[PDB]
């Protein structure tokens, strides 16, 4: 969940992983791909969002 | 290598135990190399030894390595120098800044990070993960070794 | 101040004609190294005291 | 530079050109870099020759050359430009910059001239003019992202505390910065 | 019998030795430590009187982590490995520091103790300061035995 | 070595500085002792399970 | 620091023209005796203190 | 100078000019200030 200013965009690892981890309980990783984020809306307080 | 031998594969891991103590035809991961800097496995390649094999291709670094080459440094640095001076403290009867420095190899009650309490106990990491960086400790009679 | 004085005086050159130079380079580096040395017999003088 | 103060002046010693019969005063120019220690002591101050940028300044006779320096935190690297000054700060904008760069171990590197004209345009209006000193703020250009993010700001234990979501970075973080939009692309 | 004289003579130094394999605790020392560099004997003696505030500590703290950052920041030049074939005997390493009119380092890793892939901790031996008034040219510089 | 790197440097205390600006709470914690190491020359991570 | 600062900058030449040099060859092992001369004197102080 | 002592001395160094074949010995001038601080030691 990216909440960058204004709407919130939701990437989920059905679609945006490409290589599925094994099951385990030890470590899943999941390694998302290059999500692309709309930054236009971002609220700069102090010049920083 | 910066060139490597066989065109089709660019390195070979293997695995042997008991059961399979050899070297085997396309039996480990073989890895490829694109001219872009993604390694990929080649397909050929047999993983039944392994669970799975995993290229973890955004990963360019490793953490600090407590047993390697500057292993002695870095234990003299987060383990030693805090127990050296709170040993210190503690001979001067400086009890409350004898206590801050206890707590950062190890505080009982945990550790605040910007007000949430954090996992970990041990504020070293090669105490929580138990790193052996001496391989021969009865070659002399040292307690630290 | 007798010590950065020298200093200063040590940075001009001293030789002239055909040949040119002889501004001792190393003279601020060394001033400052006999006032850190002079300031440490200062302060077990103090301490004596 | 990397959050450690750092001092950088240049440093004119005059040698003796000869010119057979006669013999000439001449000047030639370093660059020096000291940085603070821990214990508040600086360390030795490195030099680095940069004669020859001074020299591509066609600069008057007793004119210091005007002194960029600058941290930049994508591309860890202190940036260091020269220049001839002026009187406005318009004149800059074709200006040619003898720029270098200087990285933690201390190698430098000179700067190509396409590559220290985009340092020109995004930091002239810091640049010394002939009656104005100004000050340099850290180098950017329209943002300054990180590049990872490696360090959580909250975690959080699953239900029955059975598990957690915990360890993961965001190890690449890129930007396209266009006109009136910015493109954040993460690789969680 | 070769331990005779030091432990086995008496009851004494023999449950010492036999206890130390079990319980080292008993017998570390955060002061004193074999194998200590001297940073850590320097910042002891940064601390070693009666009246140590939370400045005085920290500021010998800052010390240590000064002199800390001149052995970590060590530039590796050149080396010499001692035997006639790689795969016995020790490397010598040349280290240089980052000062002009700069200091020279060597240390020493032994062959002997690599191990599955990786040296061990105790192959490495410390960076030891070299004295000599060396001013080399390009840095051609080479240790030999 | 045959086919093997031994890293011999650190750039820990390259890094450090950042961590230290602000105390020796920040230098002696464990977000300091994962400050990561560069990898040795032309070569990838890979995760054997 | 400030004398190896000064043996930096005593090895380059300041004599220029048709004579050359200057550099002060012995300027590292001065240096060097220097740093350990006053070595022995901050034992001797840290003995004291 | 603003209730100060100041001393002010003009100091000569010797130069040589060169006038070539020869060369010749010249005097260079410069003026040197001095002030005492509030504990009797000059600046």
């Known amino acids: ?28 990783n999941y390694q998302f791909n290059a999500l692309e984020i709309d930054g236009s809306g971002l609220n700069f307080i102090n010049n920083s969002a | 290598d910066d060139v490597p031998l066989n065109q089709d594969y660019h390195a070979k891991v293997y695995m042997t135990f008991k059961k399979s103590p050899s070297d085997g035809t396309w039996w480990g991961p073989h890895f490829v190399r694109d001219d ?45 120098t805090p127990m050296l001076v709170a040993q210190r403290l503690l001979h001067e009867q400086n009890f409350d800044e004898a206590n801050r420095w206890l707590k950062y190899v190890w505080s009982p009650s945990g550790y605040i990070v910007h007000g949430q309490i954090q996992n970990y106990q041990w504020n070293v990491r090669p105490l929580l993960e138990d790193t052996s960086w001496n391989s021969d400790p009865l070659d002399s009679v040292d307690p630290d070794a | 101040a007798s010590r950065l004085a020298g200093a200063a005086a040590d940075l001009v050159p001293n030789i002239f004609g055909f040949a040119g130079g002889g501004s001792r380079w190393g003279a601020i580096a060394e001033a400052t190294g006999y006032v850190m040395e002079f300031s440490a017999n200062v302060m077990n003088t103090e301490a004596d005291k | 530079y990397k959050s450690r103060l750092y001092l950088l002046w240049l440093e004119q010693k005059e040698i003796t050109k000869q010119t057979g019969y006669q013999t000439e005063t001449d000047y030639r120019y370093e660059l020096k870099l000291a940085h603070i220690r821990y214990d508040g002591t600086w360390n030795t101050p490195i030099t680095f020759d940069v004669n020859k940028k001074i020299s591509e300044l066609k600069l008057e006779k007793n004119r210091a050359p005007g002194l960029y320096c ?111 939009d910015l493109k954040i692309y993460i690789s969680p | 019998f070769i331990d005779w004289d030091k432990y086995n003579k008496r009851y004494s130094t023999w449950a010492g030795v036999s206890q130390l394999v079990y319980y080292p605790e008993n017998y570390i020392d955060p002061t004193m430590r074999i194998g200590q560099t001297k940073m850590m004997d320097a910042l002891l003696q940064s601390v070693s009187q009666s009246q140590l505030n939370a400045d005085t500590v920290e500021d010998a703290f800052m010390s240590y982590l000064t002199s800390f950052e001149q052995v970590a920041n060590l530039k590796v030049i050149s080396a010499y490995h001692d035997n006639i074939n790689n795969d016995q005997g020790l490397t010598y390493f040349i280290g240089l520091s980052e000062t002009d009119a700069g200091e020279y380092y060597w240390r020493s890793v032994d062959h002997s103790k690599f191990n599955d892939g990786k040296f061990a901790a105790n192959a490495w031996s410390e960076w030891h300061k070299i004295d000599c008034p060396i001013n080399p040219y390009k840095s051609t510089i080479r240790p030999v035995i | 070595w045959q086919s093997y790197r031994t890293r011999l440097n650190t750039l820990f205390a390259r890094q450090l500085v950042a961590r230290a600006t602000t105390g020796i709470d920040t230098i002696l914690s464990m977000e300091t002792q994962n400050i990561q190491e560069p990898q040795l020359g032309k070569g990838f991570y890979a995760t054997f399970v």
């Not at chain 2, 080649?42 to 407590?66: A, G, R, Y």
């Not at chain 4, 941290?71 to 910059?97: C, H, I, R």
């Open chain 4, 70 to 180: 600058a941290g930049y935190q994508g591309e860890d690297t202190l940036l260091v430009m020269f220049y001839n000054q002026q009187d406005t700060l318009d004149s800059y904008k074709n200006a040619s910059m003898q720029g270098l760069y200087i990285f933690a171990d201390m190698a430098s590197k000179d700067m190509t001239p396409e590559q220290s004209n985009v340092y020109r345009d995004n930091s002239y209006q810091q640049f010394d003019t002939n009656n104005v000193r100004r000050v340099n703020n850290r180098y950017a250009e329209d943002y300054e992202i990180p590049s990872s993010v490696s360090s959580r700001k909250d975690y959080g234990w699953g239900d029955y505390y059975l598990s957690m979501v915990y360890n993961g970075d965001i190890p690449t973080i890129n930007y396209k910065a266009a006109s009136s």
């Open chain 2, 36 to 80: 872009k800097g993604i390694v990929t496995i080649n397909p050929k390649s047999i993983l039944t030894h392994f669970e799975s094999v995993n290229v973890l291709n955004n990963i360019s670094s490793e953490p600090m390595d407590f047993s390697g080459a500057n292993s002695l440094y870095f234990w003299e640095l987060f383990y030693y």
């Open chain 1, 1 to 28: 969940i990216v909440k960058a200013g204004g709407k919130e965009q939701t990437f989920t690892a059905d679609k945006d992983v490409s290589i599925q981890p094994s099951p385990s309980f030890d470590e899943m």
